[PDB]
Amino acid sequence: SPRRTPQSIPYQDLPHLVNADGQYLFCRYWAPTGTPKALIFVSHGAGEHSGRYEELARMLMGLDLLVFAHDHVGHGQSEGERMVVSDFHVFVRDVLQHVDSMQKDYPGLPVFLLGHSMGGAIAILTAAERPGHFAGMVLISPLVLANPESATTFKVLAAKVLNSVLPNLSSGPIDSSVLSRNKTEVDIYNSDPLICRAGLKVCFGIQLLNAVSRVERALPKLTVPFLLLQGSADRLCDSKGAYLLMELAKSQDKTLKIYEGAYHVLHKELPEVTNSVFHEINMWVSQRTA
Numbered sequence: 001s002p003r004r005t006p007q008s009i010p011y012q013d014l015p016h017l018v019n020a021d022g023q024y025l026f027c028r029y030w031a032p033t034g035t036p037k038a039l040i041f042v043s044h045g046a047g048e049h050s051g052r053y054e055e056l057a058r059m060l061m062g063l064d065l066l067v068f069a070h071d072h073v074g075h076g077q078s079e080g081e082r083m084v085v086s087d088f089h090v091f092v093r094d095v096l097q098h099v100d101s102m103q104k105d106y107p108g109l110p111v112f113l114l115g116h117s118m119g120g121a122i123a124i125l126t127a128a129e130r131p132g133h134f135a136g137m138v139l140i141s142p143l144v145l146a147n148p149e150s151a152t153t154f155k156v157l158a159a160k161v162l163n164s165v166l167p168n169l170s171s172g173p174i175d176s177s178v179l180s181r182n183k184t185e186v187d188i189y190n191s192d193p194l195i196c197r198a199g200l201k202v203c204f205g206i207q208l209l210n211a212v213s214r215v216e217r218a219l220p221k222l223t224v225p226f227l228l229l230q231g232s233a234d235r236l237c238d239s240k241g242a243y244l245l246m247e248l249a250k251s252q253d254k255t256l257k258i259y260e261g262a263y264h265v266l267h268k269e270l271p272e273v274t275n276s277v278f279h280e281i282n283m284w285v286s287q288r289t290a
């Protein structure tokens with residue numbers, strides 16, 4: 001009987017890739033009609049999925065890039081216990097597998113990464129693993145420094161799980177309303193059956209803590225060009241992290257745009273913010289694929 005997504009759709013009916021642990025990842029592609037100028041992988045965040053990037057991906061495809069993505073293990077239409085990961089590096093390993101597969105299929109093209117939130121930490125660690133190989137990285141509110149208060153509170157729970165055997169302990173859910181000022185986008189997020197909005201399993205939050213630690217160690221060695229988009233009112237990925245990334249990265253091509261008063265999900269924020277975000281990514285990628 002065929003392997004099916006967690007929503008019961010046979011993988012044989014969907015674009016997919018099998019990762020190094022034998023788990024099926026659901027994949028998406030947006031390719032232009034002409035010859036592609038470059039490849040770009042879209043790296044989604046915690047609890048969400050690649051389908052949330054439809055509009056951004058179609059904009060990038062319109063610049064003649066071949067955009068590709070997958071749902072990370074434990075997310076969306078990919079396999080794995082929901083919101084569990086044996087180690088955070090699994091996400092990076094799987095991105096690298098998909099990139100390597102695509103570069104075989106479409107050789108000679110430069111490859112970019114775009115990542116948001118947890119997906120931005122994944123993007124940072126992916127570029128850091130392959131210094132010199134990626135042409136550029138677009139980061140929308142990447143997880144660099146967590147909100148200090150939320151992180152300290154969580155670290156209490158983390159102390160229980162790290163010192164005891166408590167496999168089912170969970171944090172309280174994040175309030176989706178404090179992550180975008182656009183109430184319609186919040187309602188869409190709350191309506192999407194592929195989003196996990198349950199409280200975070202403490203074991204997974206521990207891997208996010210590992211992600212923050214690894215990102216810190218990676219920054220002084222990062223050299224990839226990057227565009228960094230950050231809201232000043234981000235209640236999850238603290239803006240201090242974006243400033244620290246600008247300061248500590250060794251990249252010779254680094255740009256920060258701060259959106260004053262904007263919340264975390266900048267590409268699903270108020271129209272004037274999101275329109276700027278799309279425009280600024282368009283300009284930055286166009287200039288680096290000319």
Ligand SMILES: O=C(c1ccc2nc(-c3cnccc3C3(C4CCC4)CC3)oc2c1)N1CCN(c2nc3nc(Cl)ccc3o2)CC1
Nearest residue numbers: 045046117118146150171176179185186189200208209268
């Ligand atoms: O990638 C992440 C993401 C990043 C980092 C996180 N950290 C925790 C977390 C959860 N529980 C306890 C503690 C924590 C900590 C971590 C840091 C180490 C421990 C912050 C203390 O959850 C996170 C989630 N996201 C992207 C998708 N997502 C979204 N998309 C949305 N679109 C709209 Cl329109 C409205 C709303 C939305 O929300 C949600 C955000």
